[PDB]
């Protein structure tokens, strides 16, 4: 069956990537299944329930309107936290297909780094700084970077999103490129605000319990 | 005799129902309700009165994907798992009605010249593309000078590496044989062009040959070499480079 | 023989065979070395036609050819029946084009045409005849639009044909590849040559 | 590597589209990663973590059971809001491959509209009304349409979902088809109900704060 | 256009499957669109917004931090519920391509079951038990199974996730394999705890309303 | 009538591990742990006993997907970058132990006269399907003389001139050898086709 299975996708573009919708799913406006075909992809010709709509639906589901109070006893603001990492670099830049001091590009965790053969990790990092600027300048997956304080061959790295990012250590051109995770990212979205503490004695409890009301500021 | 086609090819594009609003054109446009009619009759592709294909080797593809369609043959077979209403196997109707797929999945080619109608069952997106590539003649391959170089390789026996000869000697007198009359030979290469080349390395001058029964000069049965009878009424005994050997060291 | 068992099969002289290629290819391999036996037909066919679709694959093993160059023959012919005997000049006869219901019979020789528009005058010969392979001498074909005279059983001064590239006069034997003509003809007076050839 | 990368997908059908699952993800029943392979796709033969399960998981995560109280100070019901738009049409229907008054189909934001050559935007819209009925009748991405009150060449349009829909202005057959967004869609799901207002003085605040308790009615 | 459309996907791996990001989507850290390209796929070379990030974003959106109070009047813990099902089996194992008592493998809802020809559904189920162990042992889509109490040809089945699982009845090798859904799965995630009941009289209501505060225990 | 075509297509569909119930059959079924065995041998495909892939041509395809797997030759080369354990450069191993790829990506085909065996490396879904291309090999051979006549001497030796042998003798008696039991032999040329010619000479 792989034939007409492999037949499949055509256009990529998850707009155009189909989705078996949830059977009996009203969760959208009490109306339709998540991922149901939308006027976006209709205009684009794609007539089937799709991956695109499925993302925005649950997205539109998990996003509470501004000003909504989140309440907990703990008191951590719902706001997400980005992951912050180190990128540990080592070795000397080496290209045996070019003479020493040969400008090349090196992809650091997918970030191109222009460097010349013979650069140690530090000089490599010196170039890595250039790329990370673009990674910030292009705002691609990297919120910010910072030079490792005691090490030139490491760089403190911050990611745009609140997701978790785990990458694989590799060594290119005599330069080992490894990611050292510093801070875990935390779930959340938007900007939130603690209103304050509410102490509450539950109905037949003896003990008053404290709550923390988190308004959405964004 | 007809020389027919030598390859050519066909491809069809249909869009469904009113979305075309237009009828089929040559092999360019086709139109139908796609879910209503499985397969194709092909006048739908461009037709010209050669009988186009080896039906056996048939490239029938849709989307951009190479896929085995024609005949509703497949190496998995499963006409019984053609089995609409997902009645899985065994050809006995369970749940919804099972039936034998005379047309299994994809294309079922038909009767005499070629499929007269390729008989297909699968779902498409309303805009269709179907790759129909039907070959004739053949394909040869062509390489330059490497055959004549690479093919003889197992044929011949090569010269292999050439050797310099630093040790060869010659008889300065062929009447009385041996030292004092001997002359060493200066360095030169042997690259073995013919058998005689081989022959001289295997029987350098001064080589002692013995055939048991043959009285004839070796060049007679060998074909090469200037040979002298040798050591008659004489035994061959290892000559020593240790002068202390009273007989067999000093000459 | 099932298409399910092997994708190949081999070798029984006097045993006759319905052929299923449906499940897949059938590659038949007949006995070989055959001594002087000959006299032996083998039988393959379509009771049902799975030829076309997945056809025959007929393989004689080296040695005595079935016909021609001994490469394995394939049969698209939907219905078919195969009568083949080992034939004393080390050969396996094959009934040409045949099946049930249908007389396809015998064989079709091959005529092609190539016109030579004459130019430059000169042009008393034409080389390689049809580019591939050879001309078939027995039926001479050349035209000035007057259709030119026989080459003939006896090459003659009467027969006006050069035959390939003869030094002087023109060559008594005819050759397929290259031909010559006694005439310079004329530019625009077209030498129109054809063959009746065996294979294309 | 694109080879075995491109090897990839086979069967489309996001059931069968794989997903690198979240590493150490218990969020499903405190059990498995989001998008983990499910008995649905097992039955379908697909043995890998997939996009399908990943959608329903977070879907099943972001859906609070009926009767759940959402509380805010603001007071907007959590219920989602669909987007409502105008579709602005202009020009006269034109097909130079057919004589005037030639019935053709026109895809309006992906909606086929049967119209004959020579129809101005209004007559085109007259036909567009027919298609929008089907778009409602088929319930595809379009909740409802309404004729533009002062313009026949525009149509007020409503979408089934609560997502955001932004489309590109195009001109086909001498008919310009453009979408004019009227109302923004708002995040939310199901049917919700404000219970009422709770004024709360937080623990050491002086100022009583009001809350709005939103029960889920669907 | 299907050409460059079909051009599409290459590498599968929803990391590498693109996503048209939401236009003007800040919901990630008040920063970027959901599904925006991440340092994960950058490292993997994929430079486009993708399906991967879109799942984790809304995932990271719909996951409230541990200790968060969910409040309802109803009192059902937010914690998800897995689906539990029966798998009804019938017939005798039959392989006509092998002699009777021929060990074969049977895929039960995608679970391979080694069984020999001639086994009735019960002996088939006896083997099905072996596979379900692996389905539990591999922890693939199946939380647990249990023998049907009064029927050997049925098996009580439990799924890892909280999603809904509906499968199609089929009959292989003279063995009909059907799924009988027992318990519906319920939306939720993590481990939650009811703090207790809060009776609240709303601002101008006469009637005190009770709430149920659900802390996240996981 | 049909000219037909000169070519063959081949395929396999393999299912992994236990799930098959069915052993590798012809080019129909193949069974294995896809994880365990990289590549495949082909008797598990459709085979005529000979002529796989006229060596100047190959198309081997899997899924419905169309790519150069052939021979594990590639224009990227990356025989290094075959690189299980994923070290990028220099082929020097770092971190996890790195391998110069015996088989770089996808299809390798070893064998000499033809490639009786193929090798391959990729990971697939449970079910696999393969597509295979055998062109007509037969024809191309070329070049005339002046170069090949120069090709012989500098390289492959030569037969040189053949030698009449008038002095050959044969043993009439093989237990007690020779005289009286001997036979003089009539004259004959020795042209050396093989070393046996030489060896006897």
């Amino acid at each position: 069956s792989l034939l007409n299975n492999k037949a499949g996708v055509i256009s990529r573009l998850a707009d155009f990537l189909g989705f078996r919708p949830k059977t009996g799913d009203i969760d959208v406006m009490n109306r339709q299944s998540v991922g149901s075909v939308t006027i976006s992809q209709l205009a684009k010709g794609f007539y089937e329930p799709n991956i695109e709509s499925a993302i925005n639906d649950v997205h539109n589901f998990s996003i509470k309107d501004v000003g909504t109070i989140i309440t907990n006893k703990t008191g951590v603001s719902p706001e997400g936290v980005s992951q912050t990492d180190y990128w540990a670099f080592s070795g000397t830049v080496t290209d045996d297909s070019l003479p020493p001091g040969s400008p090349i590009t090196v992809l650091v965790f997918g970030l191109p780094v222009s460097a010349t053969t013979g650069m140690t990790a530090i000089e490599f990092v010196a170039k890595v700084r250039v790329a990370l600027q673009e990674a910030i300048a292009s705002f691609t997956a990297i919120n910010s970077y910072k030079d490792h304080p005691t090490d030139g061959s490491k760089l403190e790295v911050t990611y745009l999103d609140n997701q978790k990012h785990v990458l694989s250590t590799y060594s290119t051109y005599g330069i080992t490129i490894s990611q050292e995770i510093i801070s875990e990212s935390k779930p959340g979205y938007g900007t939130w605000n603690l209103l304050g503490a509410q102490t509450v004695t539950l109905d037949n409890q003896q003990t008053p319990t404290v709550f923390y009301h988190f308004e959405r500021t964004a | 005799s007809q020389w027919r086609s030598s390859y050519t090819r066909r491809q069809i594009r249909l869009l469904d129902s009113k979305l075309t609003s237009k009828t089929s054109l040559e092999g360019s446009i086709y139109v139908t309700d796609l879910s209503t009619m499985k397969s194709i009759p092909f006048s739908a592709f461009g037709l010209i009165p050669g009988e186009p294909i080896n039906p056996n080797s048939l490239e029938v593809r849709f989307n951009g994907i190479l896929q085995e369609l024609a005949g509703t043959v497949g190496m998995p077979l499963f006409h019984c798992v053609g089995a609409d209403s997902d009645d899985e196997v065994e050809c006995s109707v369970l749940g919804g009605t099972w039936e034998q797929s005379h047309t299994d999945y994809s294309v079922e080619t038909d009767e005499n010249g070629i499929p007269e109608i390729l008989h297909f069952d699968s779902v498409f997106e309303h805009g269709d593309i179907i790759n129909i590539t039907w070959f004739n003649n053949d394909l040869g391959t062509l390489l330059t000078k490497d055959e004549i170089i690479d093919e003889t390789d197992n044929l011949y026996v090569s010269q292999g590496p050439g050797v310099d000869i630093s040790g060869d000697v010659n008889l300065t007198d062929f009447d009385k044989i041996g030292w004092p009359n001997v002359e060493a030979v200066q360095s030169y290469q042997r690259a073995f062009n013919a058998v005689s080349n081989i022959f001289d390395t295997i029987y350098p001058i001064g080589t002692i040959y013995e055939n048991a029964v043959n009285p004839n000069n070796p060049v007679t049965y060998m074909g090469f070499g200037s040979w002298k009878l040798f050591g008659q009424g004489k035994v061959l005994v290892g000559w020593n480079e240790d002068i202390s050997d009273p007989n067999f060291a000093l000459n | 023989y099932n298409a399910s068992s092997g994708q190949t099969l081999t070798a029984e002289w006097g045993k006759s065979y319905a052929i299923n290629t449906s499940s897949g290819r059938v590659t038949i391999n007949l006995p070989k070395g055959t001594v002087n036996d000959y006299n032996k037909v083998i039988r393959a066919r379509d009771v049902f036609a799975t030829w076309n679709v997945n056809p025959v694959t007929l393989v004689a093993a080296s040695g005595d050819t079935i016909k021609g160059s001994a490469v394995p023959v394939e049969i698209n012919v939907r219905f078919s029946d195969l009568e083949l005997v080992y034939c004393a000049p080390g050969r396996w006869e094959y009934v040409k084009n045949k099946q049930i219901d249908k007389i396809t019979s015998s064989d079709i020789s091959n005529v092609a045409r190539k016109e030579f528009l004459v130019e430059v005058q000169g042009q008393t010969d034409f080389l390689d005849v049809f580019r591939g392979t050879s001309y078939n001498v027995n039926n001479i074909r050349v035209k000035h639009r007057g259709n030119e005279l026989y080459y003939g059983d006896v090459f003659s001064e009467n027969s006006d044909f050069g035959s390939p590239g003869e030094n002087e006069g023109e060559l008594v034997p005819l050759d397929g590849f290259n031909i010559r003509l006694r005439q310079p003809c004329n530019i625009g007076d077209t030498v129109q040559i054809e063959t009746f050839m065996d294979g294309v």
Side-chain angles (χ1 to χ4, degrees), chain A, chain B, chain C:
Chain A
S1 64
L2 275 65
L3 183 146
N4 56 34
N5 289 134
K6 175 57 176 173
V9 165
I10 303 101
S11 57
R12 185 184 177 272
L13 271 65
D15 295 346
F16 302 149
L17 298 177
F19 173 78
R20 179 176 63 84
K22 181 178 179 179
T23 302
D25 185 5
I26 59 170
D27 292 348
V28 177
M29 296 297 292
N30 290 283
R31 303 301 303 278
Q32 62 178 19
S33 295
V34 177
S36 298
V37 60
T38 61
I39 189 65
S40 297
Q41 298 79 1
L42 296 177
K44 297 176 179 178
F46 180 73
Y47 301 139
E48 180 76 351
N50 60 40
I51 298 171
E52 180 73 15
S53 177
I55 291 172
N56 293 341
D57 290 342
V58 181
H59 179 199
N60 221 34
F61 296 164
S62 65
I63 299 303
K64 301 301 181 181
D65 290 344
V66 177
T68 302
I69 304 304
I70 284 178
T71 301
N72 59 27
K73 291 164 61 181
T74 55
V76 161
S77 178
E79 301 172 353
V81 171
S82 294
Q83 185 174 356
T84 67
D85 294 340
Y86 294 114
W87 295 355
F89 303 150
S90 64
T92 296
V93 175
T94 300
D95 185 358
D96 198 346
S97 63
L98 293 178
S102 295
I104 64 172
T105 302
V106 174
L107 297 175
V108 174
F109 295 153
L111 296 177
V113 171
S114 297
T116 65
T117 57
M119 292 179 182
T120 62
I122 307 303
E123 297 82 354
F124 177 79
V125 176
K127 301 300 183 181
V128 174
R129 294 178 178 84
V130 179
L132 293 174
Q133 294 171 337
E134 296 299 349
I136 298 170
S138 63
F139 301 96
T140 300
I142 300 103
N143 191 29
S144 65
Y145 71 96
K146 185 181 68 64
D147 293 347
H148 189 285
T150 61
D151 183 3
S153 65
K154 296 174 181 175
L155 297 175
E156 315 281 353
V157 181
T158 303
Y159 298 140
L160 293 174
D161 58 350
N162 63 344
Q163 294 179 338
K164 183 181 296 179
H165 300 290
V166 177
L167 280 183
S168 295
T169 298
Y170 63 93
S171 301
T172 180
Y173 297 138
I175 297 299
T176 300
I177 300 170
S178 61
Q179 183 175 353
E180 297 179 351
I181 294 173
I182 301 167
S183 178
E184 294 302 323
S185 63
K186 184 184 69 64
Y189 61 89
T191 306
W192 292 89
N193 189 29
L194 168 60
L195 298 177
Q198 183 179 355
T199 301
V200 169
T201 300
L202 295 174
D203 289 344
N204 54 32
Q205 287 180 335
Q206 68 301 323
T207 180
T209 302
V210 179
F211 294 96
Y212 298 125
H213 304 289
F214 299 146
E215 184 178 4
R216 178 170 178 168
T217 52
Chain B
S1 179
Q2 69 287 358
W3 182 80
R4 193 179 307 280
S5 298
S6 177
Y7 176 73
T8 64
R9 185 178 183 171
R10 294 291 177 271
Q11 294 172 336
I12 189 64
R13 178 174 186 172
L14 67 90
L15 278 69
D16 291 341
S17 176
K18 64 179 69 179
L19 272 67
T20 50
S21 297
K22 62 177 294 179
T23 313
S24 303
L25 174 62
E26 189 268 334
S28 60
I29 295 94
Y30 180 81
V31 61
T32 192
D33 291 345
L34 193 146
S35 64
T36 298
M37 179 177 179
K38 63 178 177 294
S39 69
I40 300 295
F42 61 97
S43 61
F45 299 91
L47 264 62
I48 288 97
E51 298 300 319
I53 193 186
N54 193 28
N56 315 138
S57 175
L58 198 154
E59 292 185 353
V60 46
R61 299 168 294 183
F62 58 89
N63 289 336
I65 293 170
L66 192 146
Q67 283 172 333
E68 186 276 332
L69 277 66
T72 56
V73 64
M75 39 162 293
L77 278 73
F78 293 159
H79 294 286
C80 188
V81 189
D84 55 351
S85 177
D86 71 19
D87 183 4
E88 189 185 9
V89 301
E90 278 182 344
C91 311
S92 60
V93 302
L94 275 77
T97 296
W98 178 93
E99 74 280 4
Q100 187 63 262
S101 70
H102 176 283
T103 285
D104 191 8
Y105 66 90
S106 295
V107 167
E108 187 265 331
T109 54
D110 279 339
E111 291 90 10
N112 188 339
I114 294 92
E116 293 88 4
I117 75 100
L118 60 89
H119 194 287
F120 173 85
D121 46 347
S122 171
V123 63
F124 292 162
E125 183 275 343
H126 59 283
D128 282 347
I129 57 172
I130 294 170
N131 303 131
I132 302 303
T133 303
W134 290 0
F135 296 95
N136 295 129
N137 67 344
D138 72 346
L139 296 177
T141 61
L142 173 56
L143 276 59
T144 179
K145 289 178 179 176
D146 64 14
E147 291 94 348
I148 63 102
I149 296 169
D150 176 66
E151 182 63 17
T152 60
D153 179 66
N154 53 347
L155 192 151
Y156 59 80
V157 179
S158 176
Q159 295 176 335
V163 296
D164 54 348
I165 304 304
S166 62
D168 188 10
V169 299
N170 299 135
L171 297 171
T172 62
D173 188 5
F174 297 92
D175 186 5
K176 62 191 185 73
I177 305 301
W179 294 98
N181 292 134
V182 177
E183 58 185 343
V185 179
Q186 293 84 1
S187 296
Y188 67 94
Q189 293 299 322
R190 285 175 180 164
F192 296 95
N193 297 336
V195 177
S196 180
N197 296 130
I198 305 297
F199 183 92
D200 291 344
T201 298
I202 201 61
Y203 294 141
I205 296 171
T207 301
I208 308 302
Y209 177 76
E210 300 172 353
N211 183 332
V213 299
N214 195 334
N216 295 335
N217 189 335
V219 67
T220 60
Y221 53 84
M222 294 180 182
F224 294 102
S226 299
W227 292 96
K228 183 177 179 179
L229 290 172
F230 179 80
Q232 292 181 337
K234 297 298 181 64
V235 297
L236 301 183
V237 190
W239 173 95
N240 194 343
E241 71 287 358
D242 184 5
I243 296 171
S244 64
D245 188 352
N247 293 279
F248 302 101
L250 296 176
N251 184 342
Chain C
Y1 178 81
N2 293 338
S4 65
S5 64
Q7 73 289 10
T8 189
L9 68 90
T10 189
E12 293 87 358
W13 291 101
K15 293 164 61 182
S16 177
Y17 295 128
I19 304 304
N20 186 341
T21 78
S22 62
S23 173
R25 178 71 58 174
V26 301
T27 296
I28 71 171
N29 196 30
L30 277 70
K32 188 56 174 60
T34 58
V35 69
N36 286 336
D37 177 6
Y38 297 97
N39 191 30
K40 298 295 179 61
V41 61
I42 73 100
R43 299 293 182 82
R45 66 186 59 82
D46 286 344
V47 167
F48 56 91
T50 46
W51 302 346
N52 183 332
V53 53
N54 189 322
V56 180
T57 293
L58 187 151
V59 175
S62 178
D64 288 341
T65 65
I66 59 106
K67 294 176 177 176
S69 63
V71 295
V73 297
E74 312 295 309
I75 300 170
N76 290 341
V77 184
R78 181 177 178 272
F79 290 154
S80 296
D81 188 8
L82 309 181
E83 293 178 349
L84 76 87
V85 299
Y86 176 49
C87 184
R91 186 177 179 83
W92 295 353
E93 180 277 336
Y94 172 76
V95 52
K96 299 302 289 184
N97 43 348
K98 188 182 65 59
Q99 67 178 21
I100 304 168
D101 301 349
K102 178 58 164 58
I103 295 99
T104 312
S105 293
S106 63
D107 51 350
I108 302 301
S109 176
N110 301 336
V111 54
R113 181 180 186 174
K114 190 183 293 179
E115 188 282 343
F116 296 148
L117 177 61
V118 173
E119 297 87 2
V120 312
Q121 188 64 266
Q123 193 162 351
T124 61
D125 59 350
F126 298 96
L127 278 66
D128 290 344
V129 66
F130 296 171
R131 62 181 63 81
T133 63
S134 175
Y135 179 76
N136 189 29
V137 52
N138 289 337
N139 292 330
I140 185 65
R141 293 299 184 281
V142 43
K143 296 181 175 74
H144 290 78
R145 297 174 294 178
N147 187 24
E148 188 273 314
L149 186 63
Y150 61 86
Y151 172 75
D153 59 351
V154 176
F155 171 79
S156 62
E157 298 299 318
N158 297 130
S159 63
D160 181 73
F161 187 81
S163 62
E166 181 63 10
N167 190 30
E168 293 304 321
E170 74 278 6
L171 177 64
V172 178
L174 191 153
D175 293 345
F177 296 155
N178 179 26
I179 64 100
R180 185 179 178 83
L181 181 61
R182 182 186 296 278
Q183 294 182 338
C185 298
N186 191 342
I187 175 168
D189 288 343
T190 66
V191 169
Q192 300 179 335
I193 292 174
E194 304 177 355
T195 194
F196 296 159
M197 82 196 93
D198 299 345
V200 295

